[PDB]
Amino acid sequence: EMRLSAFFRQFILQRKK
């Protein structure tokens, strides 16, 4: 029941701030 993709693994994981 979830849908996601390249978000976090390249957001939180590329979270400069």
Side-chain angles (χ1 to χ4, degrees):
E1 61 183 0
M2 298 300 291
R3 177 63 179 275
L4 30 47
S5 191
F7 139 37
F8 80 112
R9 353 72 123 257
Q10 69 259 27
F11 176 105
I12 10 90
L13 253 48
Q14 292 287 299
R15 237 187 84 184
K16 292 180 180 180
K17 260 72 175 180

